[PDB]
């Protein structure tokens, strides 16, 4: 377990994409790591509300949230190396809308 997850609280507004926090795995100290996210808000409805920069780990919200209607988003972050092999188990990330 080498996931480093900063505190995520949704903003209050743009322009979009809007950066939330930068997620990372300390495994990046041993090799290049690539990031992805799955879950509601990511790859399941509502789709694409959140996206993550594959190389930087920057998690972003893509639209004003008044456009969506769910209370919380349960995302899962993934970390793999060039070959696609996972360097961490997926980490659950709960984002609550206020």
């Amino acid at each position: 377990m080498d996931w480093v997850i900063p505190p995520i609280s949704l903003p209050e507004n743009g322009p979009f994409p809007k950066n939330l926090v930068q997620i990372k795995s300390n495994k990046d100290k041993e090799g290049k790591v690539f990031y992805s996210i799955t879950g509601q808000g990511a790859d399941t409805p509502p789709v694409g509300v959140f996206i993550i920069e594959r190389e930087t780990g920057w998690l972003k919200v893509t639209e004003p949230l008044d456009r969506e209607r769910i209370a919380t988003y349960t995302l899962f972050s993934h970390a793999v190396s060039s070959n696609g092999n996972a360097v961490e188990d997926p980490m659950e990330i709960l984002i609550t809308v206020t």
Binding site: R69, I70, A71, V97
Partner: protein
């Protein structure tokens, strides 16, 4: 409005006095020339909520490629919370919208 139904505006509403799962609730409303509750806006939601308790009631809302009403329309107002991903049917109580497993027997509301 028919006996035991509540009139609000140009519509009639039936608040059940027993519980059925989501599918059986939908069927009960259809048998009465009505539809499992499709809320149009916040004013209607707020009004109907005054007749509800903390107990949940089925409405015509489901998670089918996003939360959408049975008339095909996607949820465009309010907010719905969920405890578990298997909760794919929508319900309402006096405090708001929440998801539930469709097999759960709950009260329900019809609208004509």
């Amino acid at each position: 409005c028919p006996d035991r139904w509540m009139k609000y505006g140009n519509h009639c509403y039936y608040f059940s006095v027993e519980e059925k799962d989501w599918n059986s609730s939908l069927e009960f409303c259809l048998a009465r020339d009505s539809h499992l509750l499709v809320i149009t806006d916040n004013q209607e939601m707020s009004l109907l909520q005054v007749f509800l308790s903390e107990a949940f009631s089925w409405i015509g809302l489901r998670n089918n490629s996003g939360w959408r009403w049975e008339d095909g329309s996607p949820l465009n107002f309010s907010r719905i919370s969920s405890n578990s991903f298997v909760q794919t049917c929508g319900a309402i109580n006096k405090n708001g919208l929440q998801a539930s497993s469709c097999e759960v027997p709950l009260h329900w509301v019809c609208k004509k």
